[PDB]
Symmetry: D3
Subunit: 150 residues, 6 copies
């Protein structure tokens, strides 16, 4: 159904490079509806619980360090199959392997400076949305373009 | 040679969403030549003949109903391998499964609101071109940029 | 009411340079609705009545021969103040003097190869629309984006 | 100095039309730095104090009514001469009179559905920023592209 | 005729900000032909000769220092009225006062970091072209799209 | 270290169709740094050594005559994995089989008119770079966007 939601965040590098609008426009053009949006500098606690699944990984320290080094634009998009779709639009972990047309493929060059984060499953999205957004910062009733769904 | 032709149609959703020029420009930039172009509100007979191969499918009634609910911009492009190349540019039937960079991948979310129709083979193109366009509405003399072909 | 219409034509040079889609997209983004659209090769009779006010001018002969020299995509847009607005978007007669952001300013360099034509008044528009299009070729039910008008 | 700030808001119509990213990208490309961003549905009280200077005007009721009818993306951009510059980039009150290249000129057609609001002076900006944003939602230390300022 | 030429240079800020292709594409779309193109780090002698008319101005020292701090992409375009048309596309000296749609208007904020240099007259163009380009680095045979000129 | 370089050349058809800027912009957005750039008309000697691995092929004769038939803009980009990445961005040899989003996929239709050349390995790149550019024509101090690399 047309009510699935995913969490996306323009990372510090994406924000410093002036890519916020370009990224949001891709999702709007696709037809997803913005239900949550804000800019904040992540707190070390937010970053660690956000990337909690990687806590025992070698790159964890630098990641948390990086994500907390500058502003991040956090957003939640709503639509049919938005979690898997937003991932397809993002590309793969290494931007060098990401196909042109995707966000990482078009703008990235390094795994550690890969512009944007996207939830990889509905469980993660629900978990991540709850982590970054309060219920009052999310639109309750969404009304998409009527020409989008049958 | 480079005289192959295909029939493409911006469906009512694509027209209402203001995507006609975006779609046309994609094919012009590729190097394909426009030999026919018109806007019309398809009739139920045209809709049913156009999609005759799906007349037994559960979605036919709704397809035909949607294709006739509003204006469509019908067009025919010419150039080498245009039938298969235009399909590649369109994406796949389900927009969510279409790669970023393709038309359906970039703009659609629902199978039923997938923006554009493109002939799936040369035999289909000939059938669909004859169905939507009268002979005199098609350019007889075509001239593609001279830097496109060897 | 905001049902004003203007006639626009992408001239043979505009069509040859692959600017049809780009031009249509500018009017679609603006919010105007396409109510008639077709590609054809103008007849001398048509070109001569179209540019009737210019017969005593030295460029008339060249003008007519050029407009009848290849495909032209003809269209009629509808919307509040479309006539004057589409003119502002086109630029001025000399493309070199047209401001960057207008169609002629962005794409043209010569007065005789100035990409597009637009009616200059509602009187000229009604007259030109009836010249290029038969009544049944124009949409009767116009449904513009509901976010466009108050 | 490079520390002036202005308040911009993508109005409900701009948000429903999928223009948020396109608008933010124009300001990022210009070099202004985003210091505040959020989406919210305005409260009738916020709207009235925001447009307080028009309280005795005929259109006031519909404006407040409209601004409160759907989500608005509120933002504050920082840079040298950003208040007057953002206005120039926005266009004039009536989008029909706005030049192509500006936001209203490119996307608008009606005075009441003019896509975006921008502070008209530094006094208004300071007043409006304070109205929509809490001090903790604004970046304190801004670091622009070093290639932007001498 | 259409053999007029102008010298344009993407300054070090424009190069560092990744605006070279955007700038070149603007002139290619207009219909101007590239007859010379190179990237070089200007020498202090070149910088001072190029900007000789400003040698008494308080900002000369800093101008020359900036123009030599990094790579510049020097280029020459040919076409009818290219000198004045390219200036119009560039904007005015102060980017904040440049109209949206022009290069400086769209991308710059500081007079000292205004992205691009364009010759201000034919006499200046001839001087600057001879100063930055050796004869053999310029195309002798130029061929503009045949749909550009009457 | 991430100082890998690749040689790219916009072929005469790419230059004639006005795609130089568009092509450069794709590599600039990606984060790669232009370290050499020039426009020239290739000499038969140069074209023949460039495409040396193809002398026994039936298309070699046509290939060489074409590359020496008009201006070519030559360039060298530097960045992490630039060689393989620029190839992914180019597409494949047959433009019709290149995926939408790649340069050849977006703009080409014929194998012999495929817009751009890119080195296929670091070995070929070092070899091609030394063929088209003298050492002093290439930047020595490379300062990429600091947000690009870890
Ligand atoms: N081996 C690695 N080296 C450096 N940083 C890494 C590595 N793999 C993961 N990262 C970083 O960690 C973030 C979370 O990683 P992961 O969840 O595996 O990928 P994705 O972000 O694509 O979901 C990635 O976006 C990336 O910035
Ligand atoms: N299972 C489905 N549910 C609803 N509509 C469908 C479905 N499959 C196809 N359609 C609609 O039928 C149109 C025709 O289908 P088909 O010819 O299979 O695909 P394509 O349009 O990609 O050639 C589709 O483009 C879509 O609008
Ligand atoms: N001095 C001229 N020389 C050549 N062609 C001209 C001249 N003046 C006008 N034209 C051509 O005649 C067309 C119609 O003229 P006019 O109605 O004056 O301009 P517009 O097209 O801006 O309304 C022009 O668009 C241009 O193609
Ligand atoms: N006469 C009018 N008719 C309808 N609504 C109006 C009128 N003038 C002002 N408005 C609306 O009120 C908002 C605030 O108006 P104003 O401050 O005058 O213009 P601006 O928004 O350009 O600063 C405008 O953006 C517009 O939506
Ligand atoms: N008052 C100023 N302060 C600092 N730099 C200036 C000033 N005026 C001009 N400049 C710098 O000098 C360059 C040359 O100036 P000028 O020839 O007057 O303008 P333009 O570059 O628009 O032709 C400008 O483009 C800008 O970089
Ligand atoms: N079958 C062919 N017919 C015509 N031209 C060809 C053919 N194969 C290759 N070419 C031309 O030769 C150029 C160099 O060939 P190759 O190295 O195989 O491809 P690529 O350019 O993708 O690396 C091609 O880019 C294309 O211009
Ligand atoms: Mg992950
Ligand atoms: Mg089908
Ligand atoms: Mg006229
Ligand atoms: Mg106001
Ligand atoms: Mg000057
Ligand atoms: Mg090769």
């Amino acid at each position: 159904v047309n009510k699935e939601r995913t969490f996306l965040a323009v990372k510090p590098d994406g924000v410093a490079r002036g890519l916020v609008g370009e990224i949001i426009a891709r999702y709007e053009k696709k037809g997803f509806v913005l239900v949550g949006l804000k800019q904040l500098v992540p707190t070390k606690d937010l970053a660690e619980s956000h990337y909690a699944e990687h806590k025992e990984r070698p790159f964890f320290g630098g990641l948390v360090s990086f994500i907390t080094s500058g502003p991040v634009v956090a957003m939640v998009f709503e639509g049919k199959g938005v979690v898997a779709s937003a991932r397809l639009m993002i590309g793969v972990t290494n931007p060098l392997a990401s196909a042109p047309g995707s966000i990482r493929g078009d703008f990235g060059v390094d795994v550690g400076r890969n512009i944007i984060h996207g939830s990889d499953s509905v469980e993660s999205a629900n978990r991540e949305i709850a982590l970054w957004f309060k219920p009052e910062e999310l639109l309750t009733e969404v009304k998409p373009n009527p020409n989008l769904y049958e």
